[PDB]
């Protein structure tokens, strides 16, 4: 069976790779990986915050089926779990970096994890393996010396050496494990999960310098986003503001520091891919690159995540297939989601997909032999940051329909003609047929949830937030 190398980052935008048509972003290692595999052009996170997206990843299930509908705790045990499935298939299973699991040191079938959980301390007496390692390298030093908060919109260069940075530690420990892999006939399942480019925007100077002459794209500003248009002083606003117009210059400054941290990650991913080649493991590895969700980075005067817009839900999505499986490198436009990785792994490991998994293997689609694929992927997020930010959406990456549970507002974006989502087309006479169709799809989607979500074939305005659905493990 092929090695499975699941590489991922936290809070990386789908548009933030060179191979996604971004001219100012330096990702030569990811661009090369994508050149040798399938670049999914419409990869989505269904629930754009760390823990529900990671539950979707872990279980191959929709938010309604794994039961976490927004920013909460991943359940300690699910019926189907990515690492346990592969262990049960005879894989040696290990995870390095961010799991964001509950408890933090739960394994879900991994033989071990080596954790960077950033500043989160949840288990009694918890210190991340990264932070214990840091004290060995630099005893009495402060891994947060740079002084930028975990949720900040501001930026600064890393105030420690590059070799103490969590991105270096993550790539370095993954490189050593691959370098030392000599486990007879047992295939490796390695998860490599970067905390970055989630805030802080704290790139080393060396990586910021790679952007000295770069012009990074402006934030995109829709006609509908008036509610957050007032120009504010970033030095006076909350350092972790989820909303704010700090001007285009401020947004481009933070975006440059964001892009520098992606280029740092991309260099570590380069080391991991070279180690695999050096060990002769690359060509019979399934290699995945994804993120759990995007970063709005000033788009529509939004910061952070948990919104339906492209900057929040559109994710990087690359598969380099085993050379044996005979996939021609290409692009797939169909809407794919984090839930589709576990069933792909089942097929590649040669285990039958259970019927209670929502994702669908991606191998046929990549081979252009798929006869049944979803029309639309469902997206949602439970109330986060503000009472109004509570929603469910459907998209194929050509149209997106958004239902705001708390306000009863609808939005409709023609992604084909309006990829930046500048124009809410919900009151456009030209879009009445498409809108009628998408409202019917949202009712079909939400009906299983019962009378608090759909009553007598109508969408229900909710006054209460459901964070944990009835399908959340008991
Ligand atoms: C939805 C959202 O914005 N979630 C963020 C996470 O992305 C972040 O990882 C965490 C850090 O917590 S901390 O270690 O206490 O700073 O703070 C939460 O608010």
């Amino acid at each position: 069976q092929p090695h499975i190398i699941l590489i991922m980052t936290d809070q990386q935008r789908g548009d933030a790779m060179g191979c996604m048509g971004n001219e100012s972003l330096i990702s030569p290692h990811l661009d090369a990986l994508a050149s040798e595999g399938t670049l999914f052009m419409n990869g989505y996170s269904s629930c754009p915050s760390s823990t529900p997206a990671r539950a979707g990843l872990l279980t191959g299930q929709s938010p309604w089926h794994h039961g976490l509908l927004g920013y909460g705790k991943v359940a300690p045990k699910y019926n189907h779990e990515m690492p346990q499935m592969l262990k049960d298939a005879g894989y040696y299973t290990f995870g390095i970096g961010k799991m964001h699991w509950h408890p933090q040191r739960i394994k879900h079938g991994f033989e071990g994890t080596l954790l960077d959980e950033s500043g989160r301390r949840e288990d009694p007496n918890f210190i991340s393996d990264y932070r214990l390692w840091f004290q060995i390298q630099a005893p009495g030093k402060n891994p947060d010396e740079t002084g930028i908060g975990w949720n900040d919109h501001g930026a600064a260069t890393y105030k420690l050496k590059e070799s103490l940075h969590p991105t270096y530690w993550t790539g370095e420990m993954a490189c050593q494990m691959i370098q030392n892999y000599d486990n007879g006939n047992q295939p490796l399942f390695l998860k490599v999960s970067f905390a970055r480019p989630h805030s802080p925007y704290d790139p080393p100077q060396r990586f910021l310098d790679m952007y000295k002459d770069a012009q990074v794209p402006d934030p995109v500003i829709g006609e509908w986003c008036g509610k957050y248009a007032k120009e504010l002083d970033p030095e006076k606003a909350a350092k972790d503001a989820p909303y704010g117009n700090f001007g285009n210059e401020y947004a481009r400054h933070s975006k440059r520091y964001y892009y520098a941290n992606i280029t740092f990650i991309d260099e570590q991913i380069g080391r991991v891919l070279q180690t695999l080649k050096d060990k002769g493991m690359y060509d019979n590895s399934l290699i995945i690159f994804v993120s759990d969700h995007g970063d709005m980075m000033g788009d529509h005067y939004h910061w952070r995540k948990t919104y339906p817009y492209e900057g929040s839900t559109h994710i990087p999505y690359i598969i380099k297939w085993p050379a044996k499986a005979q996939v021609v490198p290409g692009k797939v436009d169909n809407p794919v989601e984090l839930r589709d990785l576990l069933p792909t792994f089942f097929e590649i490991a040669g285990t039958s997909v259970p019927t209670d998994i929502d994702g669908r293997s991606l191998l046929s689609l990549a081979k252009g032999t798929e006869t049944e694929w979803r029309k639309y992927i469902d997206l949602e997020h439970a109330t986060c940051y503000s009472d109004d930010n509570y929603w469910c959406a459907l998209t194929d990456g050509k149209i997106k329909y958004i239902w705001y549970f708390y306000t009863g507002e609808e939005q409709l974006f023609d992604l084909a003609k309006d990829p930046k989502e500048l124009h809410n087309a919900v009151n456009d006479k030209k879009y009445k047929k498409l809108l009628t169709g998408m409202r019917a799809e949202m009712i079909r989607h939400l009906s299983e949830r019962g009378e608090e979500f759909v009553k007598d074939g109508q969408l229900v305005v909710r006054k209460k937030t459901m964070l944990y659905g009835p399908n959340y493990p008991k």
Side-chain angles (χ1 to χ4, degrees), residues 1-211 213-226 228-323 325-371 373-397 399-428 431 433-451 453-454 456-462 465-473:
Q1 296 138 296
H3 304 299
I4 301 180
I5 316 293
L6 171 57
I7 307 175
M8 69 182 300
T9 64
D10 194 284
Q11 197 152 307
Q12 186 174 346
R13 295 166 67 101
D15 71 12
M17 295 193 299
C19 58
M20 294 290 292
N22 190 331
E23 289 312 279
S24 54
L25 194 131
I26 304 159
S27 57
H29 304 285
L30 286 167
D31 287 9
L33 183 69
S35 85
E36 292 163 47
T38 312
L39 187 57
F40 299 78
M41 295 308 295
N42 284 308
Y44 282 100
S45 175
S46 287
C47 196
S49 73
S50 176
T51 51
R54 282 169 192 284
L57 177 75
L58 174 60
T59 61
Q61 296 183 312
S62 69
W64 187 255
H65 290 142
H66 64 72
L68 183 50
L69 308 181
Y71 190 64
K73 294 170 193 281
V74 183
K77 193 72 174 54
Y78 297 95
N79 294 328
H80 306 286
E81 298 168 313
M82 188 176 264
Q84 189 68 54
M85 186 277 285
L86 288 173
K87 175 193 281 149
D88 288 352
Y91 281 71
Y92 169 82
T93 66
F94 208 89
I96 299 178
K98 173 181 183 173
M99 305 291 114
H100 209 154
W101 284 347
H102 175 66
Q104 287 176 293
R105 287 206 186 272
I106 207 64
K107 301 297 193 310
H108 292 284
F110 272 131
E111 295 204 19
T113 61
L114 197 75
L115 300 175
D116 176 20
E117 296 298 329
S118 294
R120 299 181 295 280
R121 296 188 292 120
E122 299 175 4
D123 297 1
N125 305 121
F126 181 88
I127 306 177
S128 79
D129 304 291
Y130 167 62
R131 283 173 183 242
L132 289 174
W133 176 89
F134 181 99
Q135 286 304 303
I136 301 298
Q137 315 318 117
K141 303 316 179 196
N142 183 357
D144 309 318
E145 193 53 36
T146 304
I148 301 295
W150 288 109
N151 290 313
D152 289 2
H153 48 74
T157 53
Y158 202 52
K159 294 316 190 286
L160 302 157
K161 62 189 173 165
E162 154 179 354
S163 66
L164 295 177
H165 196 282
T167 295
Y168 167 88
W169 176 83
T170 304
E172 179 57 27
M173 294 305 151
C175 279
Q176 289 183 31
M177 182 165 260
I178 296 161
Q179 190 50 63
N180 300 329
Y181 199 75
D182 172 32
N183 196 30
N185 294 347
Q186 187 166 42
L188 171 58
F189 172 46
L190 187 61
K191 181 181 170 171
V192 189
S193 176
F194 295 86
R196 295 305 186 281
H198 187 294
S199 32
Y201 312 132
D202 66 345
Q205 185 67 67
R206 189 167 80 80
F207 283 103
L208 186 61
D209 291 339
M210 294 178 184
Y211 287 90
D213 298 326
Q215 303 308 327
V216 299
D218 289 304
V220 296
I221 311 294
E223 292 183 330
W224 48 269
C225 72
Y228 309 115
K230 173 47 140 52
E231 203 158 17
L232 311 175
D233 180 346
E235 296 322 296
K236 285 159 167 13
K239 293 181 190 323
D240 55 1
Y243 307 113
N245 174 13
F246 307 124
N248 278 0
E249 189 163 69
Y250 181 86
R252 285 191 315 273
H253 181 80
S254 289
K255 188 175 288 176
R256 195 159 68 265
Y257 285 71
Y258 179 76
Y259 277 11
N261 257 340
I262 293 166
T263 301
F264 187 15
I265 293 159
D266 176 89
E267 178 158 300
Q268 294 302 318
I269 292 173
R271 299 181 62 214
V272 166
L273 301 181
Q274 196 53 59
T275 312
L276 288 166
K277 294 164 179 184
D278 284 0
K279 288 283 305 214
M281 286 167 68
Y282 183 83
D283 281 301
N284 201 48
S285 298
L286 181 75
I287 309 180
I288 315 308
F289 185 71
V290 295
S291 194
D292 55 348
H293 57 79
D295 191 319
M296 287 295 285
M297 195 60 57
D299 281 355
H300 313 292
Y301 309 128
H302 287 59
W303 301 85
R304 307 177 65 174
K305 10 83 149 82
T306 83
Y307 320 117
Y309 311 110
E310 287 296 283
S312 169
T313 53
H314 171 223
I315 51 158
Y317 212 121
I318 305 168
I319 303 182
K320 203 292 296 177
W321 302 92
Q326 268 197 110
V327 175
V328 168
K331 303 185 173 181
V332 170
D333 292 301
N334 304 251
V336 305
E337 205 269 323
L338 289 177
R339 70 185 66 170
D340 299 323
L341 295 174
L342 178 52
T344 305
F345 291 9
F346 268 99
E347 185 174 344
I348 290 291
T351 313
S352 330
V353 193
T355 77
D356 59 316
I357 278 189
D358 296 313
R360 187 182 165 81
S361 171
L362 291 163
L363 177 55
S364 306
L365 200 64
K367 284 178 86 84
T369 53
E370 184 61 78
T371 71
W373 199 260
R374 68 184 68 88
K375 183 168 190 35
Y376 304 115
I377 188 59
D378 60 292
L379 313 172
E380 74 187 283
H381 210 281
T383 306
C384 197
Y385 307 147
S386 55
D387 289 323
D388 62 331
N389 178 34
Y390 187 19
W391 57 269
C392 185
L394 289 172
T395 188
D396 56 357
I399 201 78
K400 175 180 302 169
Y401 169 82
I402 310 155
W403 170 240
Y404 281 100
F405 286 116
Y406 187 79
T407 64
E409 297 291 68
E410 298 163 292
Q411 301 187 312
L412 184 75
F413 298 106
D414 183 337
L415 295 175
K417 293 183 190 326
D418 173 34
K420 307 318 182 169
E421 304 175 298
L422 304 177
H423 312 113
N424 178 11
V426 74
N427 294 325
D428 198 320
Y431 286 90
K433 178 159 282 181
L434 273 164
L435 177 64
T436 295
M438 294 310 299
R439 203 190 276 89
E441 263 307 298
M442 182 57 64
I443 285 142
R444 178 191 198 168
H445 174 68
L446 289 189
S447 268
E448 69 181 334
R449 299 189 189 199
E451 289 277 18
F453 289 87
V454 177
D456 305 320
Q458 276 277 289
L459 296 172
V460 186
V461 179
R462 305 181 41 77
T465 303
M466 185 183 284
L467 179 58
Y468 297 99
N471 290 328
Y472 188 89

